[PDB]
Design a protein around this ligand. Structure first.
Ligand SMILES: OC[C@H]1O[C@H](O[C@H]2[C@H](O)[C@@H](O)[C@@H](O[C@H]3[C@H](O)[C@@H](O)[C@@H](O[C@H]4[C@H](O)[C@@H](O)[C@@H](O)O[C@@H]4CO)O[C@@H]3CO)O[C@@H]2CO)[C@H](O)[C@@H](O)[C@@H]1O
Ligand SMILES: OC[C@H]1O[C@H](O[C@H]2[C@H](O)[C@@H](O)[C@@H](O[C@H]3[C@H](O)[C@@H](O)[C@@H](O[C@H]4[C@H](O)[C@@H](O)[C@@H](O)O[C@@H]4CO)O[C@@H]3CO)O[C@@H]2CO)[C@H](O)[C@@H](O)[C@@H]1O
Lengths: 588, 588
């Protein structure tokens, strides 16, 4: 046993309360280094005949990545207090892993050797609005969805679909267009709409805000926003807006003042100014988003900027009943502001989804005192490298999925915002080099994956394009030009997702085929329900053996409806190039 | 290289801001497995070609424990944003460690492979009141320090210091007595007093609070507490009271009501009651501290309880201007409360020391939004197992120390409460089996370690006693029963600490000696000065070789003033049993 590979520390993904009386403990060890692991646990104050009263609970291996095995165990301390450690077995060898280090036999003359989870508290629990977990989102870039109102469209707005978007072009897309097509989305199966910035800004993306309390004229007005939202509610479709609090635009009144009045400005402390007077050349003398002079960074530590953004956050909630906030560049704003943002928001409307845009490991913002979830880009990376780019093996793809998942606690993973693309990346059909077969696979895994998936407008009907701005082409409404194959495929899966809970709340695990090269086999398990998926990731037909205890096992093909049983010789599924298949497993 | 022993994750002790512009990073690896490590760092948006602009920096081994080596790197990011990785070499064999796993060559087309520290925010910076860093506390158990006023001594008080303490005995200790001896403490070098519970309670230890708003009548009145706190301040001594918020006493008004009226009582929610009415036969039917009926657990989630305790919190600060709160059993209260607690305490007085009593790994309570520090018992353990009990070798001792130190951020270690014994543990002299020489060593290592040490009343004159109630004997004021040699020792060392900023705020490292069993060599360095310490932990004299490169190196014996230069002819200290010596190292 390699001690140096064994690790556990009382927090985040390793130790957390799942509910008011249940604790989740996770242990990490070198892959296949340990035969079995058992959690040694007991209440820190229970001592009889002058000896601590602890108990042994076997831990379950939940997954493996490139280097480790991860073990799980849920416990319900008698009086909500718990001291604990781990006993590892491998051959006649035995190791006891504690906070005090490794031992070869359970020490018992003292409870200080052990890791400790002081107490379970309802208020410190992590809790995201539960509805989000059964929602399938639709990300829309207004300027490119549908010009429902040709009168407010910006001047110069080129004919719909005329040519490719430029970082500065316009096509008159607006809030009405969204309202005008809700029928298309309801049909598709969408139950949530995430809109990129829609407030006042000179650009076509609106990330350089000029007025947070004003819907941008070229989209509509407050009256129009209410109608879209209200109308969305009736069709059972939650709405979420993008909140750009990290930075303002070159035309944000408070900034224009500093720009003109210098250090005497009443707003000079609303930004990160290094010295006056403000200057743009050679380069800004103030902080900005990246190195964009048009996007000056706001000082969320300044009490007035804080009070301002909180009000902006509660205004649209209180007055328009939005269901969520997509915090743009959320990781660049202080944890303190985020802690207040959650208090203000949740007090006003508890079930509002607070989603942070963090392009990397986000454990620090996901401890229940800040964001409910964060856009899962690591997910996108992994999924695209395997299904679209075919760069990594099935085995590896399984290790990456297992890795990222075990990086956060279960209750966090259940509310994750899984996306395959957005207005910040190339189109998936394009990443797939135009191969619709590969894409269908992307949609399959995303829709069979636990969390809160989000589809980028057009993706369902095969829209193409490279990275920004090529990915922001005008939505395709002409049927003779939109892929019907994909559309029904996505409509098909969104459906199966609703019928099978295990598909949206289930635990996931990968089965190993002798050839973990192109064959990916995994299964979701809500606990009761149990779906199995098999995907042939290769351009050639394949006979994939499907491992499963044939004793009292029945499968139900979720595509055809067909059904059948399993015997001594476990059935072998045949799939065409890039074929897949979903089976519902029943144990009788 | 063993990939399984290599580890880093963008948070807590591995990645944090040291100040408004500096950022600290750690990386651990299998012991002696890597030769050198370079930090690959660069701003996330700094691009030119299709390459991300980064710089390489060397990381220095800051120490190592039983299994790993720990590397360090201090970086002041140009625009306060950072993306980074690690290049590990072993005999000039590259290996790149990133958030996306390992590679042989450095990734360069995308910054998503890299760990990330989004932004350095002054407001999220961890920050404990600076004065503590130089303070040396003296914990007093009121009922046993001095009887400066007999008239208010409980009936039954036994002749001071004549009998052994019992769980229910009293000797007449009072606040007036502490006032009568402040000179003894000023003479000692003490610059801060931590008092155990002093608010109204029936027991002698006062942990079963009857009323959080009144001083126990037997200790004195608000008038006297004023006098004490003011005279301390006059002599430059901070005062820290004990906060028992986890659980109230049996005689606590709101609890007496819940007991009388039962389920009717408007205080029913104030506690953790399972079923009405209250009882205690098999075990209490309401949560308690451990299983102590007379100590019912408070419900800090209830807004009334929370308002009450917070009022108690700020009351004493406002009315008596105490300098810190020692939060009893702090770990069993929720984090949501500790966050409010800080906001309120710190709002009222930014320089109050919020010390939480947590008997284990406290990273969760030491992130900056809660406690400024915790009572470091792991330090107490490590130190006692080496100097007192002699159950571990010096290399092992160094390991544990390096372990507990690398588990926390440097600025957190800077405000650590380092105690060697308390009212809840046995007397260090008794643990040392009566060997003053060993106690001398304990104070040495303690009074030369970075942080906020704390002496327990009587340990400076060598009092004795086993664990509670034995450690609670009356203070001994007869110099005929005090151990002067020891007293002068403590005094002597508190002076050296006051003199050398390296001793109290410097960095520590352990030099590999010849006999890695009983000879301990270590030094404290805060860039500027450097003090060297050499200990001989054995019952026989020894000629220990001092490990130093003789080139413009001068040593100044910090005990005798004796001075001399480094030459391969005088780098060997000859010590007697349990002998020790300190040197100031001058680099000329
Ligand atoms: O004027 C500049 C740009 O402004 C607008 O971009 C927006 C995005 O649309 C938002 O989604 C967001 O995105 C940022 C992101 O927050 C930031 O971390 C960074 O992301 C990196 C990522 O960390 C890195 O690992 C790698 O993947 O590259 C990413 C770059 O995309 O950058 C994103 C922006 O590219 O915030 C920005 C700023 O508001 C507008 O949409 C763009 O057209 C415009 O160029
Ligand atoms: O009647 C009960 C006792 O009440 C009083 O005890 C106090 C202590 O003086 C405080 O310092 C504190 O101590 C707790 C501590 O907070 C708690 O974590 C626990 O500590 C254990 C630790 O968990 C365990 O791993 C091991 O290391 O032992 C530690 C202590 O031995 O228990 C401590 C209590 O001993 O709070 C209690 C309760 O207010 C009173 O002083 C005692 O005389 C009395 O017995």
């Amino acid at each position: 046993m390699r001690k140096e590979a064994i690790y556990h520390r009382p927090a985040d993904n390793f130790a957390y309360a799942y509910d008011s009386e249940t604790l989740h403990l996770r242990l990490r060890t070198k892959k296949d280094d340990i035969d079995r692991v058992e959690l040694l646990h007991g209440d820190p104050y229970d001592w009889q005949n002058g000896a601590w009263q602890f108990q042994m609970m076997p831990m379950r291996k939940t997954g493996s990545d490139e280097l480790f095995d991860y073990w799980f165990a849920e416990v319900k301390p008698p009086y909500r207090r718990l001291r604990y450690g781990f006993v590892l077995y491998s051959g006649e060898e035995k190791l006891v892993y504690t906070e005090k280090g490794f031992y070869f036999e359970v020490p018992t003359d003292d409870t200080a050797y052990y890791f400790c989870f002081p107490f379970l508290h309802r208020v410190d629990l992590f809790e995201a609005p539960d509805w989000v977990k059964d929602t399938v989102w639709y990300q829309i870039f207004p300027e490119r969805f549908a010009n429902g109102n040709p009168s407010i469209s910006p001047e110069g707005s080129r004919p719909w679909g005329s040519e490719d978007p430029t970082p500065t072009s316009f096509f008159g897309g607006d809030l009405q267009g969204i309202i005008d097509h809700l029928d298309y989305l309801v049909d598709l199966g969408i139950t949530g709409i995430y809109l990129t910035p829609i407030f006042r800004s000179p650009s076509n993306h609106k990330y350089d805000t000029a007025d947070y309390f004003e819907v941008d004229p070229h989209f509509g007005d407050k009256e129009t926003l209410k109608t879209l939202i209200d109308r969305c509610h009736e069709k059972g479709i939650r709405v979420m807006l993008d909140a750009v609090f990290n930075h303002c635009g070159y035309e944000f009144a408070p900034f224009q003042d500093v720009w003109k009045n210098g250090e005497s400005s009443k707003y000079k402390d609303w930004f990160h100014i290094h010295e006056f007077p403000l200057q743009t050349e050679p380069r800004p003398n103030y902080d900005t988003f990246a190195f964009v002079p048009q996007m000056p960074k706001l000082n969320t530590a300044n009490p007035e900027v804080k009070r301002y953004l909180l009000d902006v956050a509660t205004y649209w909630i209180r007055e328009f009943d939005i269901d969520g906030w997509r915090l743009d560049v959320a990781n660049e704003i202080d944890h303190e502001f985020w802690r207040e943002f959650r208090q203000e928001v949740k007090a006003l409307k508890p079930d509002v989804y607070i989603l942070g845009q963090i392009w990397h490991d986000a454990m620090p913002w996901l401890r229940g005192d800040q964001f409910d979830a964060v856009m899962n880009y690591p997910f996108t990376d992994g999924v695209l490298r395997f299904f679209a780019k075919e760069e990594i093996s099935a085995r590896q793809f399984a290790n990456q999925m297992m890795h990222v998942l075990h990086s956060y606690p279960n209750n966090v993973n259940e509310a994750a915002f899984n996306l395959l693309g957005s207005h910040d990346t190339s189109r998936i059909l394009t990443v797939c080099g135009g191969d619709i077969r590969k894409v269908k696979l992307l949609f399959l895994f995303q829709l069979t994956f636990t969390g809160s998936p989000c589809i980028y407008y057009g993706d369902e009907i095969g829209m193409t394009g490279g990275n920004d701005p090529e990915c922001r082409k005008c939505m395709v409404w002409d049927p003779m030009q939109q892929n019907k194959e994909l559309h029904q495929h996505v409509k098909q899966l969104i459906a199966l997702r609703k019928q099978y809970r295990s598909l949206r709340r289930g635990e996931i695990s990968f089965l190993h085929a002798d050839d973990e090269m192109n064959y990916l086999i995994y299964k979701k398990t809500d606990g009761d329900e149990t779906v199995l998926v098999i995907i042939n990731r290769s351009d050639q037909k394949a006979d994939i053996p499907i491992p499963l205890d044939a004793r009292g096992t029945w499968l139900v093909n979720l595509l055809t409806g067909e059904r059948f049983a399993a015997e001594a010789e476990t059935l072998c599924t045949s799939l065409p190039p890039y074929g897949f298949v979903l089976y519902a497993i029943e144990h009788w």
